[PDB]
Structure formats: structure tokens, C-alpha cells
């Protein structure tokens, strides 16, 4: 009741005690890189409906797309062809996944089931949730850090279909997650304006960051392991930390009203892409909110985004069945 | 080599694009529905109805309801203060950004439940009510035609010619004869003809 209202004030005093300066003040440094732009180098016109989420492969070529038409097309970003075209049980999928060994593709959406495919037939249908799924990632070839909408990030085992650790307790719908480069801890943005980093080893919360005013759509992670950025439905992309526990910047302009749909960093972390909702996707510079390119294109949405393992060419999805590759 | 690798995938690029175009003539002929408050497929005179459902998902609908923005008709089944909490749902589907161009079908519930309990108004503008005609009793048709007027009181303030409400009073032939009216009135508003 009232016995826990004073313990939170010990954190708000401590998190403001470590606020020595700002990123906006200590970056009196070299100039921004000017207006950058990218032209659509490919166009993967194969789908029939909206692309809700894709995932660029670990091979830096073979991306996997997942649309609401029932298709899971394992594309090819080099010869534009289609290596496979996997049909699905239920017509909706909201996320797809790619193993780092390049030999597994996981996909599953509003049908409450994370299915496992091996690049054509099913392998294991890891049911057990009581909500829609929102993001699936691979740790190794037998372990996935799934999200849900039932307030619970889980961790299945593809051998014998068991839930090893249930990262429970978020008081709201969970949305897209990410993964550290060390693959031992993962953040989870959710519909409570709270990006709560968990821990795979222990199996509970390690921190909890709150800097948003509305629900969180998608999230990313920094390419070293000491930060992560988060986009929400109020046209903002806040950049948090892990050793200072406070947000540093807020990437927002005056005119933008539409909410963020997907966020992913570059290879060196300097360029923070952001898939907006007003039919384009900006390129925010991570040390100063310069907005160094409008990067137009699609005419319905920018529903998902993803950068390669080598940082070569991003792949903004859409809601009119067109992927585009930008280098 | 560099001559068999290009033919390694072009035999798979042209065995798949000859299959997707044989599946494109099935997705284009399936009409998606949504029985808003587990899939089912029925047909009526050789057209495929891909009626969805939401039964297992929780009661917080703001992120699996923008996943249904290509559906042609949201079957908004409602009952006859249960109405007021089930009208702000319809108030929010209408004024939404992604479900804006989706013409809602509305099914009021069993009319004997509004006929047994009258022989309880919960609204201020129910006493001064001038009832319309073409019903059956005047003590029942004055009550049934109020929520059928209240649900249509919002549907004309943001109609804009794109999406209308098509209220009924309860059967697959009554959706087939109304899903045709959605397709005809969609093709007519783009011709600058309606």
C-alpha cells in the first residue's frame, strides 16, 4: 500500500544523483555528416498482402519475410529470386525469425503458436501461450526468446517442447524485443511505457526504465552492449542506458505526429534508423538529432525494418507487399 | 561454376512464381470477415467467405485490431449499462485511423429479449422519442428502434461516403446480400458516381 511508495523515491533520488550532464551538452564535437540518402537497390515484389514483419538473415543475404497472406517467403537479396515459399496454417503472422546458423526459420503470430521451420515442413509447434505473439528471436538452434501479449516473455526449448523460464510480470501487453551481442540478456518494450531489461541466467528483472508517455511499439539494442534505443507511439525515439539507468536524448521534431513502428541501429551505432507511420522512415543521428534524411518510398506504412549482420543494406518493409533494399 | 549457379535458382525462381500466381486466384476470391464481440469458411453461390474470429485474445484491443485493416466487413455483434460499454467500442472502431475505410455490419441481438423485459431505458433522450414506422407492437418498436437509431447516430457524423453501418435485427444470406452491397458501393465511390 503506502509502504512501497517511499522505496520508489529512493530510486528517483539515486537516478537523478548520477545525472552529471547530458549527451546534448558533452557532444560539442565534429559536425554531423550532412544530408545522406539511399535509393531502392532492389524491390522484392512477391507478396499478396501487407508485410507485417521481416528479419534479415545472419548470412547477410537471405532475408525472410512474413506477410498476412499466409506466405513466408525466404527471399534472396542478391539475385532477387525466391529460395522457398512456405505456406502457413493460420493466415496471420506478426513476426518471423532467423537462426544464426542459417538452418532454421521460426515464424508465428496471432494464432498464439510459435512454429518452427527448417529451410518447408514444420518441426515443433511450441504452443502454451494465452495471447498473441509479437517478436521471436533465436539464441541457438534449440532456444528462442519469444515475446507474447500475455505480459510474459518466455524461453522455450525446441527439444520436447518445454518452457524453461517465464519472465513474468509486466502489467501490460508486451511488444517487440531485442537481444544483446553476448546473448545472455534481453530487453522488452511493452504497452506500459516501460522498457524492462530481463536476465536469461537468473530469470527475473535486472532494471526497469521509464521515459515514455505512451505505449512502446518496437525496440532495438546498441551494437556494443551498453545501451538501447526505444520508439513509442508519441513520435519519439528515446535512447536509454545500462550503466547510468537514465535516458539521454529524445529524438523528436515539431511536425511529426505519427508513432514509431520499428527501430534498428547501424553497424557502428552512429545512425539510428526509425520506421515511422507517415509512409516514410527517418535516419536519426545518435549523437545529435539532426534527421539527416527523409528517405521516402512506400505508400502505405513502414511496418518493419532490419539491418544486416555486416551493416550493408537495410530492408524496410511496407503495407503494400513491397520490400525495398537501401544501400 | 558461374553458369550452373544462375540456373540453380532460376529453376526455383520460375517454379515458385508459377505457383504463387496459381494461389493468387484463391486469395483474391476469399472474402475476409471478423466476428467481433477459430476461423470458419462458408460459401454462398460460389464465393468464398474467410470469416475470422477473436475468441482467445484478451480484452485489450488496440494492437490486434490494426491487424484487421484489410477486412471487408467487421461483423459487430452486440446485445440489446451493457450497451454503453459496447458503444464506445463502436465509437472507437469508427474514428480509428486504420479501421477507417472498413464498413461495419451491425447485428442487434434477439428481439424477444427486448420484448419480454418491457412487458430500464437507461437513456435521457428516450421519453421524447418520435418513433418511425415500417416494423411489431408500439411498446416494443419504440424501444428496439432506439438503439438502432443510437448506433446510427454516430455512423452518419463520420460517414464520408467510404464506410456505412448496415444494421440488421436477428442468416448467412443476410450477410451475402450485404457483403455484395459493400463491393458495389466501394466501386461506385471511386468512379465519382455515388
Amino acid at each position: 500500500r503506502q509502504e512501497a511508495e517511499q522505496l520508489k523515491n529512493q530510486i528517483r533520488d539515486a537516478r537523478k544523483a548520477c545525472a552529471d550532464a547530458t549527451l546534448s551538452q558533452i557532444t560539442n564535437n565534429i559536425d554531423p555528416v550532412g544530408r545522406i540518402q539511399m535509393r531502392t537497390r532492389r524491390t522484392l515484389r512477391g507478396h499478396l498482402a501487407k508485410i507485417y514483419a521481416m528479419h534479415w538473415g545472419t548470412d547477410s543475404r537471405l532475408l525472410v519475410s512474413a506477410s498476412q497472406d499466409g506466405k513466408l517467403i525466404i527471399w534472396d537479396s542478391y539475385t532477387t529470386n525466391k529460395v522457398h515459399a512456405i505456406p502457413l496454417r493460420s493466415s496471420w503472422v506478426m513476426t518471423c525469425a532467423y537462426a544464426p546458423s542459417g538452418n532454421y526459420v521460426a515464424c508465428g503470430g496471432l494464432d498464439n503458436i510459435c512454429s518452427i521451420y527448417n529451410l518447408v515442413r514444420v518441426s515443433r509447434e511450441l504452443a502454451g501461450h494465452t495471447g498473441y505473439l509479437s517478436c521471436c528471436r533465436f539464441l541457438d538452434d534449440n532456444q528462442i526468446v519469444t515475446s507474447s501479449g500475455d505480459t510474459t516473455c518466455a524461453l522455450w526449448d525446441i527439444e520436447t517442447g518445454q518452457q524453461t523460464t517465464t519472465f513474468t510480470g509486466h502489467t501490460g501487453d508486451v511488444m517487440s524485443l531485442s537481444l544483446a551481442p553476448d546473448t545472455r540478456l534481453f530487453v522488452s518494450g511493452a504497452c506500459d511505457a516501460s522498457a524492462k531489461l530481463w536476465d536469461v541466467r537468473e530469470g527475473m528483472c535486472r532494471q526497469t526504465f521509464t521515459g515514455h508517455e505512451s505505449d512502446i511499439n518496437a525496440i532495438c539494442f546498441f551494437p556494443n552492449g551498453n545501451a538501447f534505443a526505444t520508439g513509442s507511439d508519441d513520435a519519439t525515439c528515446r535512447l536509454f542506458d545500462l550503466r547510468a539507468d537514465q535516458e539521454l536524448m529524445t529524438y523528436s521534431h515539431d511536425n511529426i505526429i505519427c508513432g514509431i513502428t520499428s527501430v534498428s541501429f547501424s553497424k557502428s551505432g552512429r545512425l539510428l534508423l526509425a520506421g515511422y507511420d507517415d509512409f516514410n522512415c527517418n535516419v536519426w543521428d545518435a549523437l545529435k538529432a539532426d534527421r539527416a534524411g527523409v528517405l521516402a518510398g512506400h505508400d502505405n506504412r513502414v511496418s518493419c525494418l532490419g539491418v544486416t549482420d555486416d551493416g550493408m543494406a537495410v530492408a524496410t518493409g511496407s503495407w503494400d507487399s513491397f520490400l525495398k533494399i537501401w544501400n | 561454376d558461374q553458369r550452373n549457379e544462375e540456373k540453380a535458382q532460376r529453376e526455383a525462381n520460375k517454379k515458385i512464381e508459377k505457383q504463387l500466381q496459381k494461389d493468387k486466384q484463391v486469395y483474391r476470391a476469399t472474402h475476409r470477415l471478423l466476428l467481433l464481440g477459430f476461423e470458419t469458411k462458408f460459401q454462398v453461390d460460389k464465393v468464398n467467405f474467410h470469416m475470422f474470429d477473436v475468441g482467445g485474445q484478451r480484452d485489450e484491443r488496440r494492437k490486434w485490431i490494426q491487424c484487421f485493416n484489410d477486412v471487408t466487413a467487421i461483423i459487430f455483434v452486440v446485445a440489446s449499462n451493457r450497451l454503453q460499454e459496447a458503444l464506445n467500442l463502436f465509437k472507437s472502431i469508427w474514428n480509428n485511423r486504420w479501421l477507417r475505410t472498413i464498413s461495419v455490419i451491425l447485428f442487434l441481438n434477439k428481439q424477444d429479449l427486448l420484448a419480454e423485459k418491457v412487458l430500464e431505458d437507461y437513456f435521457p433522450e428516450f421519453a421524447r422519442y418520435t418513433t418511425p414506422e415500417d416494423a411489431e407492437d408500439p411498446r416494443v418498436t419504440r424501444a428496439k428502434y432506439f438503439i438502432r437509431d443510437e448506433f446510427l447516430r454516430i455512423s452518419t457524423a463520420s460517414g464520408d461516403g467510404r464506410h456505412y453501418c448496415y444494421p440488421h435485427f436477428t442468416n448467412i444470406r443476410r450477410v451475402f446480400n450485404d457483403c455484395r452491397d459493400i463491393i458495389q458501393r466501394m466501386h461506385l465511390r471511386q468512379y465519382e458516381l455515388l
Partner: nanobody, 123 residues
Framework: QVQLQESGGQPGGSLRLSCAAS????????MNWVRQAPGKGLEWVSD????????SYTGSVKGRFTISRDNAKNTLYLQMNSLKPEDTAVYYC?????????????????????RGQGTQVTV
């Protein structure tokens, strides 16, 4: 964070309920009150638009009460003129989950928790 505190308190008297909004911008949020009598589920009571235009109500609390947001002190006020014995309810000050919209899904169950309790009003 998003702190929604509440304040304020014989059938037929009067009551005035005040709140706060610390953490977000208050100029562009479609705030609304939601009450729940004990034993039953949550109902709807009122609404306030982004400027003070579309002041809606429910069926039974129509005309009696009067609500106006301030938009200068991050506060909205629910003036309860001519109260009733059927208003024995706890009054949660809800929130509209997206800036610059005209829809609200803020009626349902306990899927939001980071908010003050809301004062208990009995008759």
C-alpha cells in the same frame, strides 16, 4: 513516469474531484473519467476532448455533472452537482493511450496499473 493522482472526497449534496498529470504533455490527450461501483465491473461516466469540445456522458449521469479540463495546470475537474444514491463508486481517472486521436479503449479490466487509486465517492 505517468503519474495519475486523484484528490477530493447524504444523497443530494455536491462534490468536486481534482486530479494531476505529471510526466506527459496534457494539451493533446483525450482524458476521461471511469467509475466502478463495487461488486460489478467498470462502467463509463464522462469524456473530455483535446480542447473542451466533445463533452460526452453516459446514460444516467447525463446533465447532472459537469466536467472541464484546465490544460494549464495539468488538471481536469469533475463537478458533481446533484449527486445520487446510485453513485457509490470509486472513480479512476483514465487516459487516452495515443496523442492526437479520436478513439479510446480505456474501459476494460486491470491491464493498466501504473496510476493512482482514485478517490472513493459514497452517498
Amino acid at each position: 513516469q505517468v503519474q495519475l493522482q486523484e484528490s477530493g472526497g447524504q444523497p443530494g449534496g455536491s462534490l468536486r474531484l481534482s486530479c494531476a498529470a505529471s510526466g506527459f504533455t496534457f494539451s493533446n490527450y483525450k482524458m476521461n473519467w471511469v467509475r466502478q461501483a463495487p461488486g460489478k465491473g467498470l462502467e463509463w461516466v464522462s469524456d473530455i476532448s483535446q480542447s473542451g469540445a466533445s463533452i460526452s456522458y453516459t446514460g444516467s449521469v447525463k446533465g447532472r455533472f459537469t466536467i472541464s479540463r484546465d490544460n494549464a495546470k495539468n488538471t481536469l475537474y469533475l463537478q458533481m452537482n446533484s449527486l445520487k444514491p446510485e453513485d457509490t463508486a470509486v472513480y479512476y481517472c483514465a487516459r487516452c493511450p495515443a496523442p492526437f486521436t479520436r478513439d479510446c479503449f480505456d474501459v476494460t479490466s486491470t491491464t493498466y496499473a501504473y496510476r493512482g487509486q482514485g478517490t472513493q465517492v459514497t452517498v
